[PDB]
């Protein structure tokens, strides 16, 4: 029970899905054919890994996932890849013509042709669940499918599943790997449209991941494969509480209660450590205190911003590996006295801690060293509004001259949707300012 369905939309969402499910299979000892020798209950089970994997009578462990893209190139590689036996053909849904980096085509012109089929396939997975908990939606902000189709899907899911929880893993655009000039447009449009349909969204700044791969792993020009394999570790740390169980394990929903003080303030900042190469991890062991202290170095964040210049509304530490509370408490106490950790006056300043004893895993032939203990910090800080600010400024520069707007109007959209979406972002920036002001 407590099943979670993952939906991977567009190239970014799909290619990150490949990294996450490969990593999941390695963590649970699942082979590319879906067989899991350690699973003695054939055909079914109530174990913790069953929240993400269903079981067939033949002992195959099948991801509770759907891959959707409006063109077949990316998903065809899954249909012929190493883990092709892992998914039933109906879980991999493809179109023919993509959205051409145009939100309108993803949400309307092209997307409306496949939205019913996608919902039907999602329904087939939900019907296999005894107690469905919610959805995990992986997508980019910049692409026309990741933005336009995801928004359409989130709207439809709210209708077909009420207020059942929906979490996002969103790829924030970066110029080093971006492929369209209109990505600021697609970003503001999809964020506005999904804001009321998402309960919690983890943004990933490609530039932040790009810099971490260059700085901490000595990769001259990181590729999507480099970025996705790092992203999968953060995703794994966040979902580990759902896929494993332990005494000191803390469910993600319990962190979610602390992370979302208001519905619109549901964008936690993720920070992961240690990200280190094998050459530098040799004969160097990073303790609990060292990886915890790295969580407060802005260079290790998934989104580029300065929490030192903001206020905390929540701080969560998700440890995995050889970690005991004694070491954690000592590391936190040392950090409180040597860091710029300012909370808003209406929030308790405690740190919520979870520990999953299952050690971190690495994909073979990867760049990340295999370490005995890792940590992901989920903090709610007003500083993440800087990510909205930078993106809103790019939007304002182009929209003041209506640059490229005809591509959206030609597909049926109106300027009113642009101004309406941008105004919602302005209110969101103002919302993050209000929550940081001291009380009367």
């Amino acid at each position: 029970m407590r099943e979670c369905i993952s939906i991977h939309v567009g190239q970014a969402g799909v290619q990150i899905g490949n990294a996450c499910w490969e990593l999941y299979c390695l963590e649970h000892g699942i082979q590319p054919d879906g067989q899991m020798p350690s699973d003695k209950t054939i055909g079914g089970g109530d174990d913790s890994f069953n929240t993400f994997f269903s079981e067939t009578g033949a002992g195959k462990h099948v991801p509770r996932a759907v891959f959707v893209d409006l063109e077949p190139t990316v998903i065809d590689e899954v249909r012929t890849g190493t883990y092709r036996q892992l998914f039933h053909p109906e879980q991999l849904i493809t179109g023919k013509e993509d959205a051409a980096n145009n939100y309108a085509r993803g949400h309307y012109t092209i997307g409306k042709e496949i939205i019913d089929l996608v919902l039907d396939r999602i329904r087939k997975l939900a019907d296999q669940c005894t107690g469905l908990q919610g959805f995990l939606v992986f997508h980019s902000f910049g692409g026309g499918t990741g933005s336009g189709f995801t928004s359409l899907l989130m709207e439809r899911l709210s209708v077909d599943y009420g207020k059942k929880s929906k979490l996002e893993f969103s790829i924030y655009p970066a110029p080093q790997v971006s492929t369209a000039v209109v990505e600021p447009y697609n970003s503001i449009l999809t964020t506005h449209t999904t804001l009321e349909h998402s309960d919690c969204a983890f943004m990933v700044d490609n530039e932040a991941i790009y810099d971490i791969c260059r700085r901490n792993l000595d990769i001259e020009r990181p590729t999507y494969t480099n970025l996705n394999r790092l992203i999968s570790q953060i995703v794994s740390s966040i979902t580990a509480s759902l896929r494993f169980d332990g005494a000191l394990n803390v469910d993600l929903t319990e962190f979610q209660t602390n992370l979302v003080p208001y519905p619109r303030i549901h964008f936690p900042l993720a920070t992961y450590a240690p990200v280190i190469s094998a050459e530098k991890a040799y004969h160097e062991q990073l303790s609990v205190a060292e990886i915890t202290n790295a969580c407060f170095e802005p260079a290790n964040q998934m989104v580029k911003c300065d929490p030192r210049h903001g206020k905390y509304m929540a701080c969560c530490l998700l440890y995995r590996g050889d970690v005991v509370p004694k070491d954690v408490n000592a590391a936190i106490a040392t950090i409180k006295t040597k860091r710029s950790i300012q909370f808003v006056d209406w929030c308790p300043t405690g740190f919520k801690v979870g520990i999953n004893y299952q050690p971190p895993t690495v994909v073979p032939g990867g760049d990340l060293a295999k370490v005995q203990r890792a940590v992901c910090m989920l903090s709610n800080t007003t500083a993440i509004a800087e990510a909205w600010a930078r993106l809103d400024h790019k939007f304002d520069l182009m929209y003041a001259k209506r640059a490229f707007v005809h591509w959206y109007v030609g597909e049926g959209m109106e300027e009113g949707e642009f101004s309406e979406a941008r105004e919602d972002m302005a209110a969101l920036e103002k919302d993050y300012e209000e929550v940081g002001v001291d009380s009367v």
Partner: protein, 420 residues
Amino acid sequence: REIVHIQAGQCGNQIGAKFWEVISDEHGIDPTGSYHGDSDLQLERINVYYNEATGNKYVPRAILVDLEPGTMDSVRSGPFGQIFRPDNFVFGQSGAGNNWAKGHYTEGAELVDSVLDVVRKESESCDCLQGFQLTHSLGGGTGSGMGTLLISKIREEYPDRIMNTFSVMPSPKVSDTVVEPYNATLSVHQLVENTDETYCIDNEALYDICFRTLKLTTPTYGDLNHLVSATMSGVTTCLRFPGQLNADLRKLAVNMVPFPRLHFFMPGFAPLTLTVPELTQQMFDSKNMMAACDPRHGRYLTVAAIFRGRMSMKEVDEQMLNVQNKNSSYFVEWIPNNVKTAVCDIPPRGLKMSATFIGNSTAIQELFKRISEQFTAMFRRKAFLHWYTGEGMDEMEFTEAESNMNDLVSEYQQYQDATA
């Protein structure tokens, strides 16, 4: 994602033939349509320009058009003449005589329906039709007149498809025909309204490159086409090989066309006959532009850069950043990150590494001003208008084309003067 190629007129068929020779060599296709390559990257996106037939034959998805058979008869006798589909040859006999009215309203209007039949035949069998790319000149009659007629008629049956044109701009340094400023202005009047992206192949820039750079006393049309084929191969690299950026005609247009009328691109190529910094510097140099325009006399709206060969992508990223910082004044501030770069490992024939430049610069008005200057010199005295009114046109239509092209220049200047 299939593309339908169309070549019309003398210029269109000559540069179209060279284009198919170059990419067939790159993809390992022989004059018989057989594949004898050594890399699977040559076949991954072979369907964009080639149809597969019996015996693993690859037939170009090309349509050859002309109002006179001679130019097309030479194509069938050329190196890859037998690779083209014989039924895709659609030619007349009366000819155009460098008369835009004959190609657009009279003789071409009779032959246009027989061309459309070949378009529908090719387009019907497309799994997912991208659109159409046209090769022609604007200073003739068939390519300028019937070529713009075909664009309108094709857009009527495929309004949701991309229309791309490789347009050759007339230059007195290459052709002495005097009615070319008329044919060019009338064509530009049509291209502004019915094409999504147009590569400006300026013969004046081709001549100046062959003469000044390549040191050619008397540049032949074969010399100019050597630059055209190399340019056409570069601007289509992102379409013909597995790539992330501008992989199809619509995604290219979305990144390159901020305003629908401003879709006239400035091509560039390097080297013209070497390190990555040098390639990047020459690529943004006015002497390497296939349009006779100085980019430092205007501002870039959008730019697409394609590097080919084995090189350091880290170095390419550093140099492309370096040229944008040292020349920030020539990039509009109100379009952030308007320069996109792609890298293809497969270099062109006979080169270790190359670079192709696709720019949407407000300085392209220098090219439209030159034609406008040559146009008004003849139109203010109503010279040679009987060749057009005799076919049914009126002076009003000539004035509309004049004003519409003058409006295009005013709009290019408008966004050049715009500030953040």
